[PDB]
TrEMBL record, chain D:
UniProt-recorded name of the protein: Histone H3
Gene name linked to the record: LOC121398065
Shown part of the complete sequence: 36 to 135 of 136
Family as reported in the entry's similarity comment: Belongs to the histone H3 family.
An example Gene Ontology molecular-function term: DNA binding
Sequence positions bearing N6,N6,N6-trimethyllysine: 2
Keyword set, alphabetical order: Acetylation, ADP-ribosylation, Chromosome, DNA-binding, Hydroxylation, Methylation, Nucleosome core, Nucleus, Ubl conjugation
Quaternary structure and partners: The nucleosome is a histone octamer containing two molecules each of H2A, H2B, H3 and H4 assembled in one H3-H4 heterotetramer and two H2A-H2B heterodimers. The octamer wraps approximately 147 bp of DNA.
UniProtKB/TrEMBL annotation, chain E:
Signal peptide range: none
Locations listed in the record: Chromosome; Nucleus
GO terms assigned for molecular function: DNA binding; protein heterodimerization activity; structural constituent of chromatin
Name of the protein in question: Histone H2A
Subunit structure: The nucleosome is a histone octamer containing two molecules each of H2A, H2B, H3 and H4 assembled in one H3-H4 heterotetramer and two H2A-H2B heterodimers. The octamer wraps approximately 147 bp of DNA.
Highest taxon, organism lineage: Eukaryota
Lineage of origin: Eukaryota, Metazoa, Chordata, Craniata, Vertebrata
The entry's keywords: Acetylation, Chromosome, DNA-binding, Isopeptide bond, Nucleosome core, Nucleus, Phosphoprotein, Ubl conjugation
Length: 104, 93, 79, 100, 107, 81
Protein backbone atom coordinates (compact mmCIF):
# COMPACT_ATOMS: atom_id res chain seq x y z
CA UNK A 1 0.00 0.00 0.00
CA UNK A 2 2.32 2.72 1.33
CA UNK A 3 5.86 1.65 2.20
CA UNK A 4 9.42 2.61 1.32
CA UNK A 5 10.22 1.09 -2.06
CA UNK A 6 6.76 -0.42 -2.37
CA UNK A 7 4.91 0.11 -5.62
CA UNK A 8 2.50 3.03 -5.49
CA UNK A 9 -0.03 4.54 -7.86
CA UNK A 10 -0.22 8.27 -8.46
CA UNK A 11 -2.82 10.46 -10.13
CA UNK A 12 -2.02 13.06 -12.77
CA UNK A 13 -5.10 14.82 -14.08
CA UNK A 14 -7.35 12.32 -15.86
CA UNK A 15 -4.59 9.66 -15.81
CA UNK A 16 -2.79 7.54 -13.22
CA UNK A 17 0.77 6.21 -13.09
CA UNK A 18 2.63 3.58 -11.09
CA UNK A 19 5.50 4.96 -9.04
CA UNK A 20 8.02 3.71 -6.50
CA UNK A 21 8.10 5.29 -3.05
CA UNK A 22 11.51 6.53 -1.93
CA UNK A 23 10.69 8.96 0.90
CA UNK A 24 7.75 8.65 3.30
CA UNK A 25 6.91 11.94 4.99
CA UNK A 26 6.16 12.29 8.70
CA UNK A 27 4.79 15.83 9.17
CA UNK A 28 4.99 15.86 12.97
CA UNK A 29 8.76 15.30 13.05
CA UNK A 30 9.27 17.26 9.78
CA UNK A 31 11.23 14.22 8.60
CA UNK A 32 11.17 11.88 5.63
CA UNK A 33 12.41 8.30 5.78
CA UNK A 34 14.42 7.42 2.69
CA UNK A 35 16.09 4.33 1.24
CA UNK A 36 19.30 4.49 -0.89
CA UNK A 37 16.44 6.52 7.81
CA UNK A 38 15.08 9.45 9.83
CA UNK A 39 16.21 12.55 7.94
CA UNK A 40 14.84 16.08 7.96
CA UNK A 41 14.19 18.12 4.83
CA UNK A 42 17.36 18.27 2.77
CA UNK A 43 19.19 21.23 1.28
CA UNK A 44 17.34 20.63 -2.01
CA UNK A 45 14.45 18.40 -0.89
CA UNK A 46 11.40 20.55 -0.17
CA UNK A 47 7.70 19.85 0.27
CA UNK A 48 5.02 22.51 -0.31
CA UNK A 49 3.09 23.52 2.78
CA UNK A 50 -0.24 22.10 1.58
CA UNK A 51 1.26 18.58 1.49
CA UNK A 52 4.15 18.90 3.96
CA UNK A 53 1.65 18.61 6.84
CA UNK A 54 0.10 15.44 5.39
CA UNK A 55 1.41 11.99 4.57
CA UNK A 56 3.59 12.94 1.60
CA UNK A 57 5.61 10.55 -0.54
CA UNK A 58 8.61 11.24 -2.78
CA UNK A 59 8.29 8.91 -5.75
CA UNK A 60 9.72 8.14 -9.18
CA UNK A 61 7.37 7.11 -11.98
CA UNK A 62 8.22 3.81 -13.62
CA UNK A 63 8.84 4.14 -17.34
CA UNK A 64 9.71 7.82 -16.93
CA UNK A 65 13.05 9.53 -16.45
CA UNK A 66 14.34 10.09 -12.93
CA UNK A 67 14.22 13.80 -13.76
CA UNK A 68 10.48 13.67 -13.02
CA UNK A 69 10.51 12.55 -9.39
CA UNK A 70 7.65 14.09 -7.45
CA UNK A 71 6.72 14.78 -3.83
CA UNK A 72 3.08 13.64 -3.88
CA UNK A 73 0.98 13.86 -0.76
CA UNK A 74 -1.53 11.31 0.47
CA UNK A 75 -4.15 12.95 -1.77
CA UNK A 76 -3.24 11.28 -5.08
CA UNK A 77 -1.21 8.24 -4.04
CA UNK A 78 -3.36 5.18 -3.37
CA UNK A 79 -2.65 1.69 -2.09
CA UNK A 80 -1.30 -0.53 -4.86
CA UNK A 81 -3.94 -3.16 -5.61
CA UNK A 82 -5.96 -4.81 -8.36
CA UNK A 83 -8.92 -2.41 -8.40
CA UNK A 84 -6.42 0.44 -8.72
CA UNK A 85 -5.06 -1.18 -11.88
CA UNK A 86 -8.64 -1.64 -13.08
CA UNK A 87 -9.51 2.03 -12.67
CA UNK A 88 -6.12 2.77 -14.27
CA UNK A 89 -7.47 0.85 -17.27
CA UNK A 90 -10.67 2.88 -16.87
CA UNK A 91 -8.81 6.17 -17.25
CA UNK A 92 -6.62 4.74 -20.03
CA UNK A 93 -9.76 3.83 -21.98
CA UNK A 94 -11.20 7.25 -21.14
CA UNK A 95 -8.13 8.89 -22.66
CA UNK A 96 -8.35 6.58 -25.69
CA UNK A 97 -11.99 7.50 -26.24
CA UNK A 98 -11.32 11.22 -25.73
CA UNK A 99 -8.50 11.16 -28.28
CA UNK A 100 -10.62 9.19 -30.75
CA UNK A 101 -13.43 11.72 -30.30
CA UNK A 102 -10.90 14.49 -30.97
CA UNK A 103 -9.95 12.70 -34.20
CA UNK A 104 -13.25 11.04 -35.16
CA UNK B 1 71.18 -3.88 -23.18
CA UNK B 2 70.61 -0.67 -25.16
CA UNK B 3 68.24 -0.18 -28.10
CA UNK B 4 68.73 2.63 -30.60
CA UNK B 5 65.97 4.75 -32.10
CA UNK B 6 65.49 8.12 -33.76
CA UNK B 7 64.00 9.90 -30.75
CA UNK B 8 66.74 12.47 -30.28
CA UNK B 9 66.95 13.62 -33.90
CA UNK B 10 63.18 13.81 -34.19
CA UNK B 11 63.10 15.85 -30.99
CA UNK B 12 65.66 18.23 -32.45
CA UNK B 13 63.67 18.61 -35.66
CA UNK B 14 60.52 19.30 -33.65
CA UNK B 15 62.33 21.97 -31.68
CA UNK B 16 63.43 23.46 -34.98
CA UNK B 17 59.94 23.70 -36.44
CA UNK B 18 57.97 24.12 -33.20
CA UNK B 19 60.44 25.17 -30.48
CA UNK B 20 57.68 25.01 -27.86
CA UNK B 21 55.64 21.91 -28.69
CA UNK B 22 55.92 18.78 -26.56
CA UNK B 23 55.24 15.20 -27.57
CA UNK B 24 53.97 11.98 -26.05
CA UNK B 25 55.93 8.75 -26.03
CA UNK B 26 53.37 7.01 -28.24
CA UNK B 27 53.77 9.65 -30.92
CA UNK B 28 57.50 9.09 -30.60
CA UNK B 29 57.06 5.37 -31.24
CA UNK B 30 54.84 6.08 -34.23
CA UNK B 31 57.39 8.52 -35.61
CA UNK B 32 60.19 5.99 -35.23
CA UNK B 33 58.13 3.29 -36.93
CA UNK B 34 57.35 5.64 -39.80
CA UNK B 35 61.00 6.56 -40.23
CA UNK B 36 62.00 2.91 -40.30
CA UNK B 37 59.26 2.13 -42.81
CA UNK B 38 60.41 4.86 -45.16
CA UNK B 39 63.98 3.69 -44.73
CA UNK B 40 63.32 0.11 -45.74
CA UNK B 41 61.05 1.12 -48.61
CA UNK B 42 63.62 3.44 -50.13
CA UNK B 43 66.55 1.13 -49.44
CA UNK B 44 64.88 -1.88 -51.02
CA UNK B 45 63.91 0.21 -54.01
CA UNK B 46 67.47 1.45 -54.43
CA UNK B 47 68.90 -2.06 -54.11
CA UNK B 48 66.42 -3.40 -56.66
CA UNK B 49 67.36 -0.57 -59.00
CA UNK B 50 71.07 -1.24 -58.60
CA UNK B 51 70.63 -4.94 -59.31
CA UNK B 52 68.57 -3.95 -62.34
CA UNK B 53 71.54 -2.15 -63.89
CA UNK B 54 74.09 -4.82 -62.91
CA UNK B 55 76.04 -2.52 -60.62
CA UNK B 56 77.88 -3.19 -57.38
CA UNK B 57 77.44 0.13 -55.58
CA UNK B 58 74.44 2.14 -54.44
CA UNK B 59 75.19 5.81 -55.02
CA UNK B 60 73.18 8.87 -54.08
CA UNK B 61 71.91 8.86 -57.67
CA UNK B 62 70.11 5.60 -56.98
CA UNK B 63 68.51 7.14 -53.91
CA UNK B 64 67.40 10.11 -56.00
CA UNK B 65 65.77 7.86 -58.58
CA UNK B 66 64.14 5.74 -55.88
CA UNK B 67 62.79 8.83 -54.13
CA UNK B 68 61.31 10.03 -57.39
CA UNK B 69 59.69 6.63 -57.84
CA UNK B 70 58.27 6.49 -54.31
CA UNK B 71 57.26 9.96 -53.67
CA UNK B 72 54.31 11.82 -55.18
CA UNK B 73 54.95 15.09 -56.99
CA UNK B 74 55.84 18.06 -54.82
CA UNK B 75 57.13 15.90 -51.99
CA UNK B 76 59.47 14.27 -54.49
CA UNK B 77 60.65 17.62 -55.85
CA UNK B 78 61.31 19.11 -52.43
CA UNK B 79 63.07 16.00 -51.14
CA UNK B 80 65.25 15.90 -54.26
CA UNK B 81 66.14 19.51 -53.54
CA UNK B 82 67.08 18.71 -49.94
CA UNK B 83 69.21 15.75 -50.91
CA UNK B 84 71.01 17.69 -53.61
CA UNK B 85 71.80 20.68 -51.40
CA UNK B 86 72.91 18.55 -48.45
CA UNK B 87 75.16 16.44 -50.66
CA UNK B 88 76.71 19.53 -52.24
CA UNK B 89 77.29 21.11 -48.83
CA UNK B 90 78.90 17.98 -47.41
CA UNK B 91 81.11 17.48 -50.46
CA UNK B 92 82.20 21.11 -50.36
CA UNK B 93 82.74 20.70 -46.62
CA UNK C 1 33.26 -21.14 -26.18
CA UNK C 2 30.97 -18.89 -28.22
CA UNK C 3 33.44 -16.03 -27.92
CA UNK C 4 32.25 -15.05 -31.38
CA UNK C 5 29.18 -13.98 -29.41
CA UNK C 6 31.45 -11.95 -27.15
CA UNK C 7 31.23 -9.26 -29.83
CA UNK C 8 27.93 -7.83 -28.67
CA UNK C 9 25.61 -5.97 -30.99
CA UNK C 10 26.28 -2.66 -29.15
CA UNK C 11 29.97 -2.95 -29.98
CA UNK C 12 29.20 -3.54 -33.65
CA UNK C 13 26.84 -0.58 -33.52
CA UNK C 14 29.54 1.67 -32.09
CA UNK C 15 31.95 0.42 -34.73
CA UNK C 16 29.54 1.28 -37.53
CA UNK C 17 28.89 4.66 -35.93
CA UNK C 18 32.58 5.52 -36.06
CA UNK C 19 32.35 4.30 -39.62
CA UNK C 20 29.57 6.80 -40.20
CA UNK C 21 26.52 4.54 -40.56
CA UNK C 22 23.05 5.73 -39.59
CA UNK C 23 20.70 2.74 -40.00
CA UNK C 24 21.61 -0.93 -39.56
CA UNK C 25 19.80 -4.11 -40.54
CA UNK C 26 19.45 -6.82 -37.94
CA UNK C 27 21.19 -9.38 -40.15
CA UNK C 28 24.40 -7.36 -40.23
CA UNK C 29 25.84 -8.48 -36.89
CA UNK C 30 26.32 -12.11 -37.88
CA UNK C 31 27.93 -11.11 -41.17
CA UNK C 32 30.35 -8.92 -39.24
CA UNK C 33 31.13 -11.79 -36.90
CA UNK C 34 31.97 -14.01 -39.85
CA UNK C 35 34.12 -11.47 -41.66
CA UNK C 36 36.01 -10.61 -38.49
CA UNK C 37 36.60 -14.30 -37.86
CA UNK C 38 38.03 -14.70 -41.36
CA UNK C 39 40.37 -11.76 -40.86
CA UNK C 40 41.45 -13.03 -37.46
CA UNK C 41 42.44 -16.47 -38.70
CA UNK C 42 44.22 -14.97 -41.68
CA UNK C 43 46.43 -12.86 -39.44
CA UNK C 44 46.83 -15.29 -36.54
CA UNK C 45 47.97 -18.11 -38.81
CA UNK C 46 50.94 -16.10 -40.02
CA UNK C 47 51.62 -14.72 -36.55
CA UNK C 48 51.87 -18.25 -35.18
CA UNK C 49 54.03 -19.22 -38.14
CA UNK C 50 56.50 -16.51 -37.17
CA UNK C 51 56.33 -17.47 -33.50
CA UNK C 52 57.11 -21.10 -34.34
CA UNK C 53 60.00 -20.36 -36.70
CA UNK C 54 61.44 -18.40 -33.78
CA UNK C 55 61.20 -21.60 -31.69
CA UNK C 56 59.13 -19.71 -29.15
CA UNK C 57 56.01 -20.49 -27.16
CA UNK C 58 54.83 -16.90 -26.65
CA UNK C 59 53.66 -14.70 -29.51
CA UNK C 60 55.19 -11.23 -29.51
CA UNK C 61 53.56 -8.10 -30.83
CA UNK C 62 56.47 -7.78 -33.23
CA UNK C 63 55.31 -11.03 -34.82
CA UNK C 64 51.86 -9.53 -35.25
CA UNK C 65 53.37 -6.45 -36.85
CA UNK C 66 55.25 -8.64 -39.31
CA UNK C 67 52.07 -10.54 -40.13
CA UNK C 68 50.15 -7.34 -40.80
CA UNK C 69 53.02 -5.97 -42.87
CA UNK C 70 53.10 -9.03 -45.08
CA UNK C 71 49.32 -8.82 -45.53
CA UNK C 72 49.52 -5.24 -46.80
CA UNK C 73 48.13 -3.67 -43.61
CA UNK C 74 51.04 -1.81 -42.07
CA UNK C 75 50.65 -0.85 -38.42
CA UNK C 76 52.61 1.75 -36.47
CA UNK C 77 52.85 2.46 -32.78
CA UNK C 78 54.31 -0.88 -31.69
CA UNK C 79 57.84 -0.98 -33.13
CA UNK D 1 -1.60 15.36 -21.15
CA UNK D 2 1.82 14.47 -19.79
CA UNK D 3 3.98 13.12 -22.58
CA UNK D 4 7.55 11.83 -22.27
CA UNK D 5 10.18 13.53 -24.37
CA UNK D 6 11.88 11.50 -27.07
CA UNK D 7 13.90 12.53 -30.10
CA UNK D 8 12.86 11.46 -33.53
CA UNK D 9 14.55 8.44 -35.12
CA UNK D 10 17.88 9.31 -36.71
CA UNK D 11 18.73 12.02 -34.17
CA UNK D 12 20.61 9.88 -31.66
CA UNK D 13 22.23 8.09 -34.60
CA UNK D 14 23.72 11.31 -35.94
CA UNK D 15 24.77 12.34 -32.45
CA UNK D 16 26.63 9.07 -31.99
CA UNK D 17 28.24 9.25 -35.42
CA UNK D 18 29.56 12.65 -34.42
CA UNK D 19 30.68 11.35 -31.03
CA UNK D 20 32.61 8.35 -32.35
CA UNK D 21 34.09 10.20 -35.31
CA UNK D 22 35.81 12.39 -32.71
CA UNK D 23 37.34 10.03 -30.15
CA UNK D 24 39.90 7.33 -30.87
CA UNK D 25 39.73 4.87 -27.97
CA UNK D 26 38.86 1.24 -28.60
CA UNK D 27 35.22 0.19 -28.72
CA UNK D 28 35.32 -3.57 -28.16
CA UNK D 29 35.50 -4.98 -24.66
CA UNK D 30 38.99 -6.22 -23.92
CA UNK D 31 38.35 -9.56 -22.24
CA UNK D 32 35.87 -10.97 -24.79
CA UNK D 33 38.21 -10.02 -27.60
CA UNK D 34 41.12 -11.67 -25.80
CA UNK D 35 39.12 -14.84 -25.22
CA UNK D 36 38.10 -14.98 -28.87
CA UNK D 37 41.68 -14.45 -30.00
CA UNK D 38 42.94 -17.24 -27.77
CA UNK D 39 40.18 -19.59 -28.91
CA UNK D 40 41.06 -18.92 -32.55
CA UNK D 41 44.70 -19.46 -31.64
CA UNK D 42 44.15 -23.16 -31.01
CA UNK D 43 43.61 -24.75 -34.43
CA UNK D 44 47.21 -23.83 -35.28
CA UNK D 45 48.97 -24.76 -32.04
CA UNK D 46 48.13 -25.50 -28.43
CA UNK D 47 49.22 -23.90 -25.16
CA UNK D 48 50.38 -20.67 -26.76
CA UNK D 49 51.27 -17.75 -24.54
CA UNK D 50 50.73 -14.14 -25.53
CA UNK D 51 52.36 -10.81 -25.01
CA UNK D 52 49.61 -8.38 -24.08
CA UNK D 53 50.87 -5.90 -26.66
CA UNK D 54 50.26 -8.52 -29.36
CA UNK D 55 46.60 -8.72 -28.37
CA UNK D 56 46.39 -4.92 -28.31
CA UNK D 57 47.85 -4.69 -31.81
CA UNK D 58 45.41 -7.32 -33.01
CA UNK D 59 42.50 -5.38 -31.55
CA UNK D 60 43.68 -2.14 -33.14
CA UNK D 61 44.22 -3.62 -36.59
CA UNK D 62 40.91 -5.48 -36.50
CA UNK D 63 38.97 -2.39 -35.45
CA UNK D 64 40.59 -0.25 -38.13
CA UNK D 65 39.83 -2.85 -40.79
CA UNK D 66 36.23 -3.12 -39.65
CA UNK D 67 35.78 0.65 -39.65
CA UNK D 68 37.07 0.84 -43.21
CA UNK D 69 34.75 -1.97 -44.24
CA UNK D 70 31.83 -0.25 -42.52
CA UNK D 71 32.49 2.96 -44.42
CA UNK D 72 32.71 1.13 -47.74
CA UNK D 73 29.46 -0.66 -46.95
CA UNK D 74 27.86 2.69 -46.17
CA UNK D 75 28.92 4.01 -49.56
CA UNK D 76 27.50 0.92 -51.23
CA UNK D 77 24.16 1.21 -49.42
CA UNK D 78 23.89 4.89 -50.28
CA UNK D 79 24.57 4.01 -53.91
CA UNK D 80 21.55 1.73 -53.59
CA UNK D 81 19.43 4.76 -52.62
CA UNK D 82 19.13 3.44 -49.07
CA UNK D 83 20.09 4.52 -45.57
CA UNK D 84 20.11 1.06 -43.96
CA UNK D 85 22.98 -1.37 -44.46
CA UNK D 86 22.19 -4.97 -45.37
CA UNK D 87 24.63 -7.87 -45.69
CA UNK D 88 24.60 -7.88 -49.49
CA UNK D 89 26.22 -4.45 -49.25
CA UNK D 90 29.07 -5.88 -47.18
CA UNK D 91 29.42 -8.77 -49.60
CA UNK D 92 29.65 -6.45 -52.60
CA UNK D 93 32.17 -4.28 -50.76
CA UNK D 94 34.45 -7.20 -49.95
CA UNK D 95 34.01 -8.54 -53.47
CA UNK D 96 35.17 -5.28 -55.00
CA UNK D 97 38.02 -5.02 -52.50
CA UNK D 98 39.26 -8.35 -53.84
CA UNK D 99 39.01 -10.19 -50.52
CA UNK D 100 36.28 -12.42 -51.96
CA UNK E 1 92.31 16.08 -35.65
CA UNK E 2 89.16 16.29 -33.54
CA UNK E 3 86.20 14.17 -34.58
CA UNK E 4 83.59 16.08 -36.59
CA UNK E 5 80.25 14.55 -37.48
CA UNK E 6 79.49 14.02 -41.14
CA UNK E 7 76.00 15.30 -40.36
CA UNK E 8 77.56 18.63 -39.40
CA UNK E 9 79.56 18.61 -42.63
CA UNK E 10 76.27 18.19 -44.45
CA UNK E 11 74.54 20.39 -41.87
CA UNK E 12 71.87 17.85 -40.91
CA UNK E 13 70.33 16.44 -37.76
CA UNK E 14 70.01 12.79 -38.79
CA UNK E 15 72.99 10.55 -37.93
CA UNK E 16 74.62 9.90 -41.29
CA UNK E 17 77.09 7.45 -39.79
CA UNK E 18 74.33 5.30 -38.34
CA UNK E 19 72.62 5.47 -41.72
CA UNK E 20 75.76 4.29 -43.49
CA UNK E 21 76.21 1.43 -41.04
CA UNK E 22 72.62 0.31 -41.49
CA UNK E 23 72.97 0.53 -45.26
CA UNK E 24 76.04 -1.69 -45.09
CA UNK E 25 74.36 -4.21 -42.80
CA UNK E 26 71.07 -4.28 -44.71
CA UNK E 27 72.32 -6.61 -47.47
CA UNK E 28 71.20 -4.13 -50.11
CA UNK E 29 74.44 -4.16 -52.11
CA UNK E 30 78.06 -5.15 -51.67
CA UNK E 31 79.41 -1.62 -52.04
CA UNK E 32 77.81 1.54 -50.69
CA UNK E 33 78.49 4.93 -52.20
CA UNK E 34 80.09 7.53 -50.00
CA UNK E 35 77.49 10.24 -50.63
CA UNK E 36 74.50 7.93 -50.35
CA UNK E 37 73.87 8.02 -46.57
CA UNK E 38 73.99 11.81 -46.66
CA UNK E 39 71.26 11.89 -49.30
CA UNK E 40 69.12 9.43 -47.38
CA UNK E 41 69.49 11.25 -44.07
CA UNK E 42 68.59 14.53 -45.75
CA UNK E 43 65.43 13.07 -47.26
CA UNK E 44 64.40 11.45 -43.98
CA UNK E 45 64.95 14.66 -42.05
CA UNK E 46 62.93 16.64 -44.58
CA UNK E 47 59.97 14.27 -44.42
CA UNK E 48 60.12 14.26 -40.63
CA UNK E 49 60.08 18.05 -40.61
CA UNK E 50 57.05 18.12 -42.88
CA UNK E 51 54.97 15.73 -40.79
CA UNK E 52 56.08 17.34 -37.54
CA UNK E 53 55.12 20.80 -38.78
CA UNK E 54 51.65 19.69 -39.80
CA UNK E 55 51.11 17.79 -36.56
CA UNK E 56 52.24 20.76 -34.50
CA UNK E 57 49.77 22.94 -36.37
CA UNK E 58 47.02 20.47 -35.55
CA UNK E 59 47.99 20.18 -31.88
CA UNK E 60 47.99 23.96 -31.56
CA UNK E 61 44.52 24.00 -33.11
CA UNK E 62 43.52 21.69 -30.26
CA UNK E 63 45.17 24.06 -27.76
CA UNK E 64 47.53 21.29 -26.67
CA UNK E 65 51.27 21.37 -26.06
CA UNK E 66 52.14 17.77 -26.96
CA UNK E 67 51.49 16.01 -30.24
CA UNK E 68 49.35 12.91 -29.74
CA UNK E 69 48.65 10.13 -32.27
CA UNK E 70 45.32 11.76 -33.06
CA UNK E 71 47.10 14.88 -34.26
CA UNK E 72 49.36 12.72 -36.40
CA UNK E 73 46.42 10.95 -38.02
CA UNK E 74 44.62 14.23 -38.64
CA UNK E 75 47.68 15.80 -40.23
CA UNK E 76 48.43 12.79 -42.42
CA UNK E 77 44.88 12.26 -43.62
CA UNK E 78 44.24 15.97 -44.17
CA UNK E 79 47.33 16.29 -46.37
CA UNK E 80 46.80 14.90 -49.85
CA UNK E 81 50.32 13.74 -50.70
CA UNK E 82 51.03 12.48 -47.19
CA UNK E 83 47.80 10.49 -47.04
CA UNK E 84 48.55 9.04 -50.47
CA UNK E 85 52.01 8.02 -49.29
CA UNK E 86 50.58 6.40 -46.16
CA UNK E 87 47.67 4.87 -48.03
CA UNK E 88 48.06 1.37 -46.58
CA UNK E 89 49.29 2.57 -43.18
CA UNK E 90 47.39 2.26 -39.92
CA UNK E 91 48.11 4.54 -36.97
CA UNK E 92 47.20 3.33 -33.50
CA UNK E 93 44.71 5.54 -31.66
CA UNK E 94 44.55 7.63 -34.81
CA UNK E 95 40.81 7.69 -34.93
CA UNK E 96 39.20 8.81 -38.16
CA UNK E 97 38.49 12.06 -39.92
CA UNK E 98 35.12 13.39 -38.75
CA UNK E 99 33.04 13.03 -41.91
CA UNK E 100 29.32 12.41 -42.38
CA UNK E 101 27.61 11.78 -45.70
CA UNK E 102 25.28 14.55 -46.84
CA UNK E 103 22.27 12.36 -47.58
CA UNK E 104 22.14 11.24 -43.95
CA UNK E 105 21.82 14.84 -42.78
CA UNK E 106 18.36 15.95 -41.57
CA UNK E 107 16.42 17.91 -44.16
CA UNK F 1 50.80 14.37 -80.99
CA UNK F 2 47.57 16.09 -79.96
CA UNK F 3 44.08 14.70 -79.34
CA UNK F 4 44.87 11.01 -79.60
CA UNK F 5 42.69 10.11 -76.61
CA UNK F 6 39.81 10.41 -79.05
CA UNK F 7 41.63 7.73 -81.03
CA UNK F 8 40.05 5.37 -78.51
CA UNK F 9 36.89 4.83 -80.50
CA UNK F 10 33.53 4.16 -78.92
CA UNK F 11 33.22 0.68 -80.55
CA UNK F 12 36.45 -0.25 -78.79
CA UNK F 13 34.91 0.78 -75.47
CA UNK F 14 31.86 -1.32 -76.25
CA UNK F 15 34.08 -4.29 -77.00
CA UNK F 16 35.96 -3.78 -73.74
CA UNK F 17 32.73 -3.60 -71.76
CA UNK F 18 31.34 -6.69 -73.49
CA UNK F 19 34.43 -8.70 -72.66
CA UNK F 20 33.83 -7.43 -69.15
CA UNK F 21 30.35 -8.92 -69.23
CA UNK F 22 28.39 -5.67 -69.52
CA UNK F 23 25.08 -5.66 -71.38
CA UNK F 24 23.73 -2.08 -71.41
CA UNK F 25 25.96 0.97 -71.71
CA UNK F 26 25.31 4.64 -71.02
CA UNK F 27 26.45 7.26 -73.50
CA UNK F 28 27.99 9.46 -70.79
CA UNK F 29 30.48 6.68 -70.01
CA UNK F 30 33.06 6.80 -72.79
CA UNK F 31 34.76 10.06 -71.83
CA UNK F 32 34.90 8.87 -68.22
CA UNK F 33 36.70 5.73 -69.36
CA UNK F 34 39.03 7.86 -71.45
CA UNK F 35 39.94 9.95 -68.42
CA UNK F 36 40.52 6.96 -66.16
CA UNK F 37 42.65 5.26 -68.79
CA UNK F 38 44.67 8.43 -69.27
CA UNK F 39 45.31 8.57 -65.53
CA UNK F 40 46.41 4.94 -65.50
CA UNK F 41 48.66 5.39 -68.52
CA UNK F 42 50.29 8.47 -67.05
CA UNK F 43 50.94 6.65 -63.79
CA UNK F 44 52.69 3.75 -65.47
CA UNK F 45 54.56 5.78 -68.09
CA UNK F 46 56.04 8.16 -65.53
CA UNK F 47 57.81 5.35 -63.70
CA UNK F 48 58.73 3.62 -66.96
CA UNK F 49 60.48 6.77 -68.14
CA UNK F 50 62.15 7.06 -64.75
CA UNK F 51 63.60 3.58 -65.21
CA UNK F 52 64.63 4.35 -68.78
CA UNK F 53 66.51 7.50 -67.82
CA UNK F 54 68.19 6.10 -64.71
CA UNK F 55 69.81 3.66 -67.11
CA UNK F 56 70.81 6.72 -69.16
CA UNK F 57 69.12 5.27 -72.24
CA UNK F 58 67.20 6.95 -75.04
CA UNK F 59 64.68 4.21 -75.86
CA UNK F 60 62.15 2.67 -73.50
CA UNK F 61 62.32 -1.11 -73.21
CA UNK F 62 59.40 -3.33 -72.31
CA UNK F 63 61.43 -4.69 -69.42
CA UNK F 64 61.16 -1.25 -67.83
CA UNK F 65 57.40 -1.41 -68.33
CA UNK F 66 57.35 -4.72 -66.49
CA UNK F 67 59.23 -3.15 -63.60
CA UNK F 68 56.87 -0.19 -63.51
CA UNK F 69 53.82 -2.45 -63.44
CA UNK F 70 55.37 -4.57 -60.71
CA UNK F 71 56.00 -1.45 -58.66
CA UNK F 72 52.31 -0.58 -59.05
CA UNK F 73 51.28 -4.00 -57.79
CA UNK F 74 49.98 -5.11 -61.20
CA UNK F 75 52.27 -7.93 -62.27
CA UNK F 76 52.33 -8.97 -65.92
CA UNK F 77 53.83 -12.19 -67.25
CA UNK F 78 54.96 -13.12 -70.72
CA UNK F 79 56.95 -10.04 -71.68
CA UNK F 80 60.48 -11.12 -70.89
CA UNK F 81 59.84 -11.67 -67.21
Amino acid sequence: EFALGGRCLAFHGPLMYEAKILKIWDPSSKMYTSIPKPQKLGEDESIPEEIINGKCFFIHYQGWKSSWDEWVGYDRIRAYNEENIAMKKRLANEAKEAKKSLLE
Amino acid sequence: TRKESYAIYVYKVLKQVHPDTGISSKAMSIMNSFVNDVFERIAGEASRLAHYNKRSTITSREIQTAVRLLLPGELAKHAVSEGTKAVTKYTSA
Amino acid sequence: RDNIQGITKPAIRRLARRGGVKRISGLIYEETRGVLKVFLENVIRDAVTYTEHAKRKTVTAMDVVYALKRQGRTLYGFG
Amino acid sequence: VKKPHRYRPGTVALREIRRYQKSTELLIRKLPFQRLVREIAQDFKTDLRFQSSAVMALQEASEAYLVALFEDTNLCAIHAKRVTIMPKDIQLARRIRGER
Amino acid sequence: AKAKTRSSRAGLQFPVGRVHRLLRKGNYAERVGAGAPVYLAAVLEYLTAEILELAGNAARDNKKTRIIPRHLQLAVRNDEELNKLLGRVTIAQGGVLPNIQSVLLPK
